[model samples]
Target: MVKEVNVPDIGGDEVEVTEVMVKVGDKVAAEQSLITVEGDKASMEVPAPFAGVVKELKVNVGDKVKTGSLIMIFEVEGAA
Candidate 1:
């Protein structure tokens, strides 16, 4: 099923989108890094919550995003 992946909670800080690690139609695994972000404390990579093929990317490099922001869309297996 196609699903939207949102940025998880990160102490309410807005983070800069440093890198987009996947593209449309790319296959990704659960917990795989989809984007790299940098915040006040340190840098981190956002991982996929489930294995799937990427359908879309909603953020760009240098864009600032907060928790719950739309990150990407994925076609995941076993999703309803």
Candidate 2:
């Protein structure tokens, strides 16, 4: 089934995307790093919420993102 992947609460305000770790068609494991973002004081990597194949990427390097921003479309396994 298709699913939207959004950024989780990173304990800060908007952050700049610094790296996109996965490409379209890449298979990702649950909790695997998907993107890295840099805030005012630190950088953090966002992880996939479930195991899936990436279908699309919504953000790129240099884009600013916040908590709950849509970051990817995924094809989840075993969904209805």
Candidate 3:
């Protein structure tokens, strides 16, 4: 299954992608940190909601993102 990874709430402020921890073909476990974002107040690591292999990354370092913005694509074990 191909699933989308979206940016989560960041205290209602826009945050910039500071680091991308995974890449295409990388394996990630559920809740694993995928990217780091820096907001006006603080920095946070965004985790994968489910275990999967990274298929694509939609955002990159220095890119500003908001809640619900597409962050990446993951290929999981089941579903289509």
Cα deviation at 70, candidate 3, in Å, is 1.0
Task: Give the clashing residue pairs of candidate 3, or none.
Answer: none
Residue lDDT tens for model 1, 13-65:
67888888888888889677878888777887777767878887766899877
Residue 46 displacement (Å), model 1: 1.0
Local error of candidate 1 at residue 20 (angstroms): 0.8
Tell me the spans in candidate 2 whose CA falls farther than 4 Å from its real position: 77-80
Between candidates 2 and 3, the TM-score winner: 2
lDDT of 3 by residue, 2-42 (tens): 88878765666678889888998888886778788887767
lDDT of 2 by residue, 1-80 (tens): 67988888677878878988899888888778888889787778888877868887767799877788888898875442
Best by TM-score: 2
Please give the lDDT score at residue 50 for candidate 3: 72
TM-score against native, each model: 0.79, 0.85, 0.82
Clashing pairs in 1: none
